[PDB]
Design a protein around this ligand. Structure first.
Ligand SMILES: NC(=O)C1=CN([C@@H]2O[C@H](COP(=O)(O)OP(=O)(O)OC[C@H]3O[C@@H](n4cnc5c(N)ncnc54)[C@H](OP(=O)(O)O)[C@@H]3O)[C@@H](O)[C@H]2O)C=CC1
Ligand code: SF4
Ligand code: SF4
Ligand SMILES: [Zn+2]
Lengths: 208, 176, 96, 114, 144, 287, 95
């Protein structure tokens, strides 16, 4: 208990609980889950038709400033009707608190493209388009950054395998570097390590 | 606690403005920079004449990938496959058979020296300390064929020296 | 160094920072190796007779995150935290 | 089932935007075969452009057609700029076989191609 | 005292042994820092450690000609050292290997065959495995 | 037959194919494109070089990981040639120099080289040996080069019966000899028929013959699909290039068809004309 | 203990030496095959059979924390010697 166990502080837990119920009171149009972890960071789980209202609210209003933007990743969870998750990760400058706006989406329907209100979101948005495929309507510039120009597939899905379909080599028949389907030298032997016996008891989902 | 920089003002006294004017029209601070660089000229440079003076090191370097063996005995490995399970680029490849005795042994033990990223995870992981990151770092190889070490390569590379390896392990078996 | 007085005087004159003292050619704190074999102590583990692992069972203490509102006059509007205090100029040679 | 599509409302705007994009590709290819110092006649390049249009012909949904229009527009912009190179344009073609036919006989001699 | 350094500097020219031996190690690469003779070892090579020089120029090795018959007057390689002096020379210790020479092992080569890429003798990769599936041989008797 | 010789799946980049190919020469032109097409096929290629290792260093990495292999050889002895054919499934004679040197004339390369290698190939147990030659190299006049190739054809026909004697016409490509000689001159013209054939049609035919059994012993000759005038060809080369001695006898004299013996379409590979590839390959004009 | 193969190539400690139908011989051209010269099988008969009079004894491997972990072997077979799996060297009991 006292040694080697990272102690939690319930003060931040209670204050973020009050702040979360406050947000769910004042924006009832879009709020679904307001969850607080044990390490006391706020997680607000949101429908993707209030991205512009929630961010235009949470940038201002003088109960929570939150100027700073960070990570946006649309973490691909299958077995859902909506695969991808846009995760905005917002930081204050006056208050020292971190909130995670997790809004959901699918492969095709656009989110509202936050670049009009957070200027940092431009290359983050271009990266999420080039790696996942979440189109951003009413956005100025969608190009490819971090992948090749002759490349397609949105490689950070789960449906894109670890090796590539294309692979380059030089050949002198045409004096240039050409693309061929993959012919590995070793298998990348993947080891089964999902060991049984339920290493955590508090997270048992309800069975049938 | 904050200690900000660049907050002075130009003092309009005659002394300060004629000092800044002398700085401008008389190249004084540039001569100061030349003075600092010549002050490092007349030192003695810390180079080492390389192929005669090798550099310093630690007794915990990660080099050659040797194998060991028991005192007046046979090989120390077992083929317990922990090093293939922990090799973070999976350069280790182990195919194991038992021989005519019954004690378990190997057939094939491979390191890709290309894919080896020299962690020391197979140094920490091996229970009998069979594989040791070797001491020296001189590989300098012409072809790509040579850089795929075999088990007999690693045995003849552990037979090439152990006195180094045994001295370093006895220096540093107490920490790790 | 290990040399005459005129060139050492020109070195001190080209930069008055006492060049013979701190010269970046070390001769003395080459660490005396083959040290005595160090014993690594262990603190609040391996003590017998009380170390029930269920007591310090820190992995199992991770609760699932507590849920507040869903889709499935109250004098309020607190902030997530108190406003952070404005700092101070430090004493260790500030500006100005 | 609440779906907000990208640009169109039905396949009429799909046909409109794809015929505009094909017009752009048709007048953009001879500029590139002048610029990149290629090895390919103009009509061979135009035929493989219309081949790439014909490959995706069995798509019905308006969102997917609009998203293909987006993909083709992005790559046409990156080819009218000089941001791509000769490797990429030759990567669109196939002058490095890949020779394996669709014969069951050749897929019997060459092993294990059902 | 500028002429005293030229007098002191002329002595380590003769401290190597003379002129023709002096010209040998000078035109080999550089070194004129002779004077201590810590250790000689088989294949003729010598080892010097001074305490007036700093960390990195403590210890150095001078190789002999034709140690493996390879005309190594020129083109000295790395790993032309035996391994105990390889422990001594990287400053992995404070003792020469005349303090603890041996080991309790009867398998060490007498040679320390040096770096051998681009030679008549270089390493090759090969599978250390026997037959895979043991292809069947048809019987030798004829029929019909 | 023995394992690790059977084919495996797809082709190229350590996809192992059946052949183990010993290729002579290959530091020049046609052997280099043949090594490239074997590396695209993905087989183990033994190449002996008498020359510097640096030239085969620049034509080296087309093979995959440990696929190609090097050794040394000469045109005097048999021990290095036997060392080259210690274990070889197929072997090709692609040798020749188009100008006489001090140590070797046109004599004794075409005479001395194929005797020894055909002898040790028939002895040391190889299969499907393939020998190149020039088209219409006869006993007829005006070329010591071509009569020596006729002598070599006589020897390779007589000893080692089960060969494939093959001959292309004058071939053109990225490092061609005579087309670069056409671009690099200084000039006059006659009437002389000539068929050129692009180099990759020839090497596709060669590798199809080297993997195809049951068409062996039949000698082949290669066909240019146009077969038109020399002076029109020089006009077309100067037109696409924007500008207005045994070799010169060889190019001026004759290049004819021979309907006796089969060619491209009797093996099944599409011919490519001069004009398309000539627009492709004629760079290096002004600016 | 190399074997006089018809190829003449050195065998290994594992029976993997080639045939006359192997082209890996012709990739060993001019490059001398480095085989292990000191084997692992025959180095047990070089070591004497130790005799420890007790019943169930303990093997470590020549020094603490340098070797194999503690293995407590049994010597109850009247005619078969004990054998540590890690070490490989035998033990006998003295009545
Ligand atoms: N139109 C054409 O180009 C035609 C070509 N051919 C054949 O195609 C091949 C390639 O054509 P090309 O470029 O003109 O010829 P190359 O000279 O380029 O190719 C022959 C290769 O073998 C080497 N070689 C030849 N003779 C000797 C020798 N006596 N000793 C050692 N090495 C030798 C050459 O030089 P090195 O030793 O420096 O490696 C070169 O590596 C040749 O075999 C030629 O006979 C035949 C008919 C028509
Ligand atoms: S971890 Fe050690 S004992 Fe286990 S297989 Fe690897 S080298 Fe052998
Ligand atoms: S040090 Fe090398 S062999 Fe060992 S685990 Fe790391 S990458 Fe693998
Ligand atoms: Zn034991």
């Amino acid at each position: 208990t006292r040694p080697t166990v990272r102690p939690r502080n319930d003060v931040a837990h209670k204050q973020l609980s009050a702040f979360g119920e406050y947000v769910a009171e004042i924006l009832p149009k879009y709020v679904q889950q307001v969850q607080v972890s044990c390490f006391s960071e706020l997680e607000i789980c949101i429908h993707p038709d209030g991205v512009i209202p929630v961010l235009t609210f949470l940038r201002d209003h003088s109960n929570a400033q939150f100027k700073s933007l960070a990570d946006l990743t649309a973490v691909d969870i299958p077995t859902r009707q909506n695969r991808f998750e846009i995760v905005y990760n917002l930081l204050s400058l006056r208050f020292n608190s971190r909130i995670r706006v997790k809004t959901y989406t699918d492969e095709l329907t656009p989110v509202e493209s936050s670049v009009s209100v957070y200027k940092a979101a431009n290359w983050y948005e271009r990266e999420i388009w080039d790696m996942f495929g979440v189109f951003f309507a009413n956005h100025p510039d969608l190009r490819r950054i971090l992948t090749d120009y002759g490349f397609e597939g949105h490689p950070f899905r789960k449906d894109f395998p670890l090796s590539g379909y294309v692979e380059l080599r030089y050949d002198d028949e045409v004096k240039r570097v050409v693309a061929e389907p993959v012919e590995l030298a070793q298998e990348f032997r993947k080891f089964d390590l999902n060991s049984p016996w339920e290493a955590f008891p508090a997270y048992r989902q309800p069975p049938e | 606690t904050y200690k900000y920089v660049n907050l002075r003002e130009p003092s309009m006294d005659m002394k300060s403005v004629t000092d800044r004017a002398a700085q401008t029209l008389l190249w004084t601070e540039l001569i100061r920079g030349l003075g600092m660089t010549l002050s490092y000229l007349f030192r003695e440079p810390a180079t080492i004449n390389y192929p005669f003076e090798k550099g310093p090191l630690s007794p915990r370097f990660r080099g050659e990938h040797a194998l060991r063996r028991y005192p007046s005995g046979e090989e120390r490995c077992i083929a317990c496959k922990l090093c293939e399970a922990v090799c973070p680029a999976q350069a280790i490849t182990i195919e194991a058979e038992p021989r005519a005795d019954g004690s378990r042994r190997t057939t094939r033990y491979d390191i890709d020296m290309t894919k080896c990223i020299y962690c020391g995870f197979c140094q920490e992981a091996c229970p009998v300390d069979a594989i040791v990151e070797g001491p020296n770092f001189e590989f300098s190889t012409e072809t790509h064929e040579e850089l795929l070490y075999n088990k007999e390569k690693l045995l003849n590379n552990g037979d090439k020296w152990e006195a180094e390896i045994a001295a370093n392990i006895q220096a540093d078996y107490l920490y790790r | 160094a290990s040399a005459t007085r005129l060139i050492q005087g020109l070195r001190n004159w080209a930069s008055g920072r006492d060049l013979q003292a701190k010269l970046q050619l070390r001769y003395q704190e080459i660490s005396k190796r083959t040290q005595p074999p160090p014993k690594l102590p262990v603190g609040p583990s391996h003590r017998l007779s009380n170390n029930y692992y269920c007591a310090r069972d820190g992995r199992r203490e991770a609760m699932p995150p507590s849920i507040v509102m869903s889709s499935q006059s109250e004098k309020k509007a607190v902030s997530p935290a108190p406003p952070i205090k404005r700092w101070e100029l430090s004493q260790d040679e500030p500006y100005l | 089932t609440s779906v907000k599509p990208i640009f169109s409302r039905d396949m009429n705007e799909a046909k409109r935007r794809v015929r505009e994009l094909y017009r752009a590709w048709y007048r953009e290819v001879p500029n590139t075969v002048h610029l990149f110092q290629l090895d390919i006649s103009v009509k061979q390049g135009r035929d493989k452009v219309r081949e790439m249009f014909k490959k995706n012909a069995h798509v019905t949904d308006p969102r997917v057609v609009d998203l293909l229009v987006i993909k083709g527009k992005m790559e046409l912009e990156e080819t009218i700029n000089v941001w791509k190179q000769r490797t990429h344009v030759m990567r669109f073609f196939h002058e490095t076989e890949a020779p394996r036919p669709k014969d069951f006989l050749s897929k019997f001699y060459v092993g294990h191609d059902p | 005292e500028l002429l005293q350094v030229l007098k002191r500097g002329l002595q380590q020219v003769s401290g190597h042994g003379g002129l023709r031996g002096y010209l040998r190690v000078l035109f080999r690469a550089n070194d004129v820092r002779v004077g201590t003779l810590v250790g000689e070892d088989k294949y003729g090579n010598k080892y010097y450690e001074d305490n007036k020089q700093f960390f990195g120029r403590h210890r150095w090795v001078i190789y002999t000609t034709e140690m493996n018959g390879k005309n190594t007057f020129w083109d000295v390689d790395g790993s032309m050292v035996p391994p105990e002096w390889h422990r001594w020379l990287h400053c992995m210790t404070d003792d020469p290997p005349t303090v603890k020479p041996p080991t309790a092992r009867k398998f060490i080569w007498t040679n320390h065959k040096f770096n051998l890429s681009g030679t008549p003798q270089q390493y090759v990769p090969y599978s250390t495995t026997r037959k895979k599936i043991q292809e069947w041989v048809p019987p030798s008797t004829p029929y019909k | 037959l023995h394992h690790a010789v059977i084919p495996h799946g797809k082709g190229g980049r350590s996809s192992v194919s059946g052949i183990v190919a010993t290729v002579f020469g290959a530091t020049g032109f046609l052997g280099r494109y043949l090594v490239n097409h074997l590396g695209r096929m993905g087989s183990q290629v033994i190449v002996p070089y008498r020359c510097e290792p640096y030239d085969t260093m620049h034509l080296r990495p087309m093979g995959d990981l440990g696929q190609i292999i090097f050794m040394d050889w000469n045109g005097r002895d048999k021990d290095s040639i036997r060392r080259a054919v210690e274990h070889s499934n197929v072997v090709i004679n692609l040798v020749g120099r188009e100008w006489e040197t001090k140590n070797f004339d046109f004599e004794d390369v075409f005479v001395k080289i194929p005797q020894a290698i055909a002898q040790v190939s028939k002895e040391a147990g190889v299969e499907k040996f393939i020998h190149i030659s020039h088209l219409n190299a006869d006993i007829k006049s005006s070329s010591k080069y071509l009569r020596n190739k006729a002598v070599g054809e006589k020897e390779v026909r007589e000893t080692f019966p089960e060969a494939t004697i093959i001959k292309p016409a004058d071939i053109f490509g990225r490092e061609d000899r005579f087309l670069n000689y056409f671009a690099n001159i200084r000039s006059l013209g006659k009437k002389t028929v000539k068929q050129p054939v692009y180099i990759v049609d020839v090497t596709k035919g060669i590798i199809n013959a080297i993997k195809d059994p049951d068409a062996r012993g039949k000698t082949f000759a290669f066909v240019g699909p146009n077969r038109y005038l020399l002076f029109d060809l020089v006009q077309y080369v100067f037109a696409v290039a924007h500008r207005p001695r045994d070799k010169v006898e060889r190019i001026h004299t004759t290049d004819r068809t021979l309907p006796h013996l089969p060619g491209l379409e009797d093996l099944g590979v599409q011919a490519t004309p001069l004009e398309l590839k000539a627009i492709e390959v004629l760079r290096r004009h002004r600016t | 203990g190399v074997r006089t193969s018809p190829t003449g190539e050195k065998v290994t400690h594992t029976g993997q030496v080639y045939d006359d139908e192997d082209y890996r011989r012709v990739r060993f051209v001019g490059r001398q095959k480095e085989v292990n010269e000191n084997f692992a099988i025959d180095l047990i008969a070089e070591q004497p059979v130790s005799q420890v009079g007790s019943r169930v004894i303990s093997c470590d491997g020549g020094g603490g924390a340098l070797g194999h972990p503690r293995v407590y072997i049994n010597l109850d077979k009247e005619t078969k010697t004990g054998t540590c799996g890690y070490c490989g060297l035998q033990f006998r009991q003295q009545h």
